Design a protein around this ligand. Structure first.
Ligand SMILES: *[C@@H]1O[C@H](CO)[C@@H](O[C@@H]2O[C@H](CO)[C@@H](O)[C@H](O)[C@H]2NC(C)=O)[C@H](O)[C@H]1NC(C)=O
Ligand SMILES: CN1CCC[C@H]1c1cccnc1
Lengths: 400, 400, 400, 400, 400
């Protein structure tokens, strides 16, 4: 329209986009800053990068862009693109993007009274410290620090407004707890003027159903399978294979967890502690299996069972476990031959008796170590899992 | 031509690309918006990003860009590149590309009566929620939401036209069910003016032949092969190897499947339910194999067969399964010697009979558990597969 | 020089880059379009993207860029950068790139009579249908479609010229079969005017030496290795281990091949069919081995061989391949004792005879299944490999 | 305000950004250059790239940009964007990104006296040689070289100021040892005019807790487990399986480590040396157990143990290792038969005596090789670990 | 300063950056071109892309950019940014970057007499054919082709200058043999004017220490370990397991090398030939093991040893190997019973003698095949390794 054309012609005249829109140059310009969070795009623990979708909200007052609505009775607001009016140079300090500024430059809407609104959208990547001490049950706080780059406290006075989460789209992995904000002015070695900034803290809680069903459960099942080796009779040689194959499966689980986790040395993580506990458990199980096999294939002639070992294993542990221990001259020539044969049979009988004793001792040791290892693994797993804070809260909210 | 040059020089006189081309400023401006879908390039499940090829379609009317055809013979249309004339700032809301705008800026075609068309092409990356509850038999709905950014309800009037699928190029993996659209109007915390938008909901179906053949059939086959452990005789010690090796193959299969799936806690997917059930089935088979081996290698004098176990196994299940149960002083000195030898032989025969009885009991248990495990695995697999909706539709459309 | 400066100053006065350079405004402008292929950079089958290196040859005539060489003796041609003169806007329709147009803008060379040449180079990424029905003996046709985005048939007259492959650099994996092209006119739902376009079809053939030597040969070797299970005597205990390890190796081979194929559902790839056939063959071999092991560790008194089974195996099949068959009162008391001993020995002899006959039956089954499985493997492999078209051509051209 | 607008209009009059702002045109312009490190984003050893967060600091004096505060009350500083005033083209020489310049251009702040400050932020990717000789106990020095690209010391004088680490954010992987800088001058064969440049040498240490816990401890554990072959009795046939499976685990660990290391031939990494040592140890263990199995299964009638071997093993080693060493007409034919039976039993007896001798020899060999391997592995591991410089301080810092 | 400002104002008067700065238009313009290589950043064999860091060097003479130093006492040289003066359009013909130009546009330094220098830095990605026939003992030549795009030989005269490698930084993996260059002019389908270009051929050698230590030696070691299957006694049934597991390790090695290696079909790589040979050797070892086990478990009454087999094995090969071959009515009734027992014992004796003969034959075959396979693997490995050219030079440079 003619009124719109005349207004655009008049406003642009004698306008310098390099000048701060203030009637009085000695007074700070008040700028209100906020943001609206739309989506938590990604959390990268290995690279420690948070990717989010955010609309920034900037509001201020321009002294020159004012007109009387009566003279232009059809237009109430105007729009100006980048590079033709003054705009705050607000940037995100802790950016992790190859381009430091990742905001799409849109139009700026102006009142008839000179009120400027700026709503740039963006996919922001920031670098926030990620704590993996209590993973999977960790809670993360990520910082987003915004501030002007070349405007101190005597020129541009930054003000904070509460973040808007009405349009937030729930994520399938993280639960949004809150997004508080705080405004603070700091000092820099460059300059002698304080510089304000606004920091928004995003608090997120990781949902644990996927991890607790894909990592925790198979670990306990496979550890139980390793415990099962204490039930196989020693007469079938399939114990070492069981133990070693279980160890291999644990190693592949460890490589998966290692490829999904950051290489930080800040603290030992809970999953690593669990894997180490299972490592020692299965290794000691294999060692005990070797000891049992050594006892089982004991040569009867090789030696005699120590008195202490006998008095322990065959009586105390047997009673405790309620296991019962199993148990003319030609005529003279024929006579001595059959005597020799009978004596040979007697010797074989004594040898088999000693062998049976050794086998019983091996069985007793096997049963004792089965019970002990079951108790140990149950206690260790329960303690390690429950040591995490808010573990019960996570379990309730996810599974229940 | 001279007429074209004269018209181009005349049209841009006193023009201003910053103003809305309306004869009356109070009245709004009508803009018709639509799109043409060319190809669905990629659907990402881990990152939940949809990549598509789309030609936008914007049409409107410009008041100033009008001329008489008679005064300028030959010329009927003109083309204006970016920055010469006014354009709507139509943006995709739920974008996911590093640059918030993915459209490629082309010319704008204008008729002799002031009618502007704008059809820019683009590779659009959007963020839509992906449901993996019924994977791989799932149907996905991905929403693309376009709208003006800085133009309100009384300035720009958005009208929806039907989408174009005439130029669609079919995708091997995905089947395009449809693409309806809806024009809505929303309020925002920024402002007191309604803002319209147009949302197109691409509804797509996943073709299941590839995933079926390369995921489910080998799983079924090797799960059935794991049942061969009940056909091997216990005399050959090659049962634990069977069980633990098929378990390892299953574990690597689960790892491969997990490496393609999102880490969401919304629900437990069908493929995960299948794999978990088969894991427990194989583990129970291994435990039963251990028990059977324990029965097979029972010590002849290590105990007595319980009456309950005998009456349960030897005569009940064997009858049910139709199993046949298998089966002169020198002279006096030689006399007592041969008596000793014969007595030892008789004792050995009795021990052999007891061992044979125990072995038959083990075989009976093995056969019983074979039948039970086969029934259970077939029932579980059929139930889990049939529980999904439109599974019969997917089968009839893909395999047949 | 002075003439160059004068001509450059004169050629720009009253020149509009927005104006189509034709003497008569109602006549179309003839533009000649052609390709120049330099290298085939990549063929991504998983993402179905073709990356190539091409130069675009565009030629046309400009009315206003004409001069007489007798006035500027030194200069014969001129050069104009982007944005200074009118240029055609030919774009590639099927572009699978973030930016829809990947061409490096270079200078436009102009005659002394107004002939403009434009030769922009570029690495082009396009989306074309890649079919893996005949992998790895497939021939691929990929289309590149070029056309003016906003100029109709009445305005811009597109003409086709034969593509140039003189500077083509041969690729180590794909063999260039050809690259013809064709013009076409199409209508669009936008408008009521035909839009010409030029489509160039690149036809390429894959060289199969690497894929054959790295996939086909090792799988056949492992199949032959798995066929050895029927040569191992049943007295050893490694049959199942051999079979299952072969199965594991081919499972990882299947994973390696599967990570490179697109997830398409159009057909079943040849390599997928061949892998499935090998899987079934090895599984049946394992089942047969289990049957034989059950058939060899048979209890002597646990049953009797059926007459049908005996007349099938012991005589018929054995003769088929010429297998030989493996074949005072004290005196009275000691008398009965030695009779008992001898009778025990006789019963043992009868039992071992029955066991030996059972073992011979097992050996016969092993031999028969060896022959059958070898025949099946040979027939299936030969048929599957020979089913592919141009397989003889590929072998003759890649194994010479 | 009016004063700000008037000053902005006045300053840019007759201003040329191409001109270097010096009052004499024959004396160099002094530029103070400094750096402010914020965070070490990444250290990619495979590609040898260091990614950091940097705040450049450039200060100089502009002769033309001066005014009087009294004539422009309230205005004390001004801001100038790109292309408005002169800037020094200071670049990083060893950049390793697509576009050579990775800085983000911001405003330039000018005081009333003409002092200009410039603090552009950036995420800088640089190429520094990374030493992996003592990985993981390594210390890395990476150099950042900054200098003007076109101006020289006769026109631009560079000066060095100490780097700022006030805002440094600790990394969970690297410890910042320091960042010393140095200003250097380079001369040319043409002219006696110095050319200055600045170099910052970021030296940092790697925290070894994660790498040690995830690599060394599991490998030592499994290497010690590989020694269990010498405790298994030869009757249980699992020694070879145990050893070869530990070899498989070794290969898995070797590939996992190799995927992270660069393919450098400068030296042999410490981790590679240690893995090779463990390879050799386990391989020799396999050879030894093969020898032991060969001795244990010796044919009693297939040979005689030589006197040298007898005195070496049976006597000397057993004494050293305290291994106890185990251990009417009819009557004529009746005599013949019983004598034959007795002699057959005696022959069997001497045979099993020889077999027992061989088995004892195998046991002694096994025990002595167990002791030798046990001491050797400990010595080799301790030596390799201790050979690394600063190992003691590294472990103290990372664990205590 | 005033003189610098005046000179800058005067030089750009009437200057047209679209014209060649030549006094005579007929004569060509001489441009000197060279480059300085700083670092070889990457050599991607799979994609066949060379990424390097270079500085271009262009020198020419400008006719209009001349002035008298006496009039401007302080000014000696000037600087002009992009778009202000004429520059050559030199491009890299075989670029592989997504943007065809990778140079960073810097300032152009201008003499006091018109000489112009231009040194833009760049990270260049180029596509060069990489031959891996002799991998890893390979020497690679990669060509960088530079030339003007729109200027022919009659206008722009390209001249070569020797490249500078003074600032080259050695690479850990690649040894720089050298970079010579050649200038040549060609004809194109454009037009009938020759176009010159400069091609620099970078020749480099790969350092083989890393690959030899990490890929070759482990293959040799485990291949030698696979030969231990010929020393294991047949009683310990763990030969097939050993062979199949070394097979599995070999397959994973082949998987890794397939991962690193490009999929070309020009020739069979040396490492591929080596791995194929090792596959064949271990497979034949497994076949021989199967034959040996078949001979070992021979039914004594199932057949008779052939006279041939006897004369080749039992004595001929034993001589060849110095192998020693191992080693009243009651009275009548009692008599016949005991003689029956004795005859039974005689039968067992002759059966065990036959079995011992078969076992000795198996041992002889085992030793023969051990020696043959050792010779085969040694000669094959030595020949394959030594077949490569410059293998001795590579070994002497990378190990001594
Ligand atoms: C404008 O800013 C600059 C900042 O460098 C001032 O220069 C410095 O002022 C302080 C206080 O006197 C001292 O460090 C030195 O006098 C100056 N440093 C250098 C390197 O010159 C300058 O004084 C300010 N001018 C006005 C009018 O405020
Ligand atoms: C040698 N140049 C580069 C390739 C073609 C040729 C050329 C000729 C004219 C205009 N553009 C390019």
């Amino acid at each position: 329209g003619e009124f719109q054309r005349k207004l655009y012609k008049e406003l642009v005249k004698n306008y310098n986009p390099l000048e701060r829109p203030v009637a009085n140059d000695s007074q700070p310009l008040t700028v209100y800053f906020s943001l609206s969070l739309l989506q938590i795009m990604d959390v990268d623990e290995k690279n420690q990068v948070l990717t989010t979708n955010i609309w920034l909200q900037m509001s201020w007052t321009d002294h020159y862009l004012q007109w009387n609505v009566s003279e232009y009775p059809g237009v109430k607001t105007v729009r100006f693109p980048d590079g033709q009016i003054w705009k705050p140079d607000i940037l995100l300090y802790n950016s992790a993007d190859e381009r430091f500024d990742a905001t799409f430059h849109t139009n700026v809407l102006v009142n008839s009274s000179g009120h400027c609104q700026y709503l740039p959208p963006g996919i922001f990547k920031s670098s926030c410290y990620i704590d993996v001490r209590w993973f999977p049950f960790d809670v993360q706080h990520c910082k987003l620090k915004f501030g002007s780059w070349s405007y101190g406290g005597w020129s541009l006075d930054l003000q904070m407004q509460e973040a808007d989460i009405s349009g937030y789209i729930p994520n399938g992995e993280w639960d949004l707890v809150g997004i508080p904000g705080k405004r603070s002015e700091r000092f820099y070695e460059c300059c002698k003027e304080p510089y304000p900034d606004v920091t928004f803290t995003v608090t997120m809680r990781r949902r644990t159903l996927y991890y607790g069903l894909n990592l925790l459960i198979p670990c306990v099942l496979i550890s139980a399978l390793a415990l099962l080796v204490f039930l196989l009779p020693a007469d079938s040689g399939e114990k070492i294979s069981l133990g070693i194959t279980v160890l291999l499966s644990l190693t592949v689980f460890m490589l998966l967890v290692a490829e999904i986790m950051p290489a930080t040395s800040d603290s030992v993580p809970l999953i690593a502690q669990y894997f180490a506990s299972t490592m020692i458990i299965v290794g000691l199980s294999v060692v005990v299996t070797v000891i049992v096999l050594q006892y089982h294939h004991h040569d009867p002639d090789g030696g005699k069972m120590p008195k202490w070992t006998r008095v322990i294993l065959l009586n105390w542990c047997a009673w405790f476990l309620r296991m019962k221990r199993p148990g003319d001259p030609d005529l003279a020539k024929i006579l001595e031959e059959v005597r020799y044969i009978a004596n040979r049979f007697r010797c074989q009988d004594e040898s088999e008796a000693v062998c049976s004793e050794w086998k019983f001792a091996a069985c007793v040791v096997d049963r004792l170590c089965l019970m002990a290892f079951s108790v140990f693994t149950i206690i260790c797993t329960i303690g390690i899992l429950m040591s995490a804070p808010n573990f019960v809260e996570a379990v309730s909210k996810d599974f229940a």
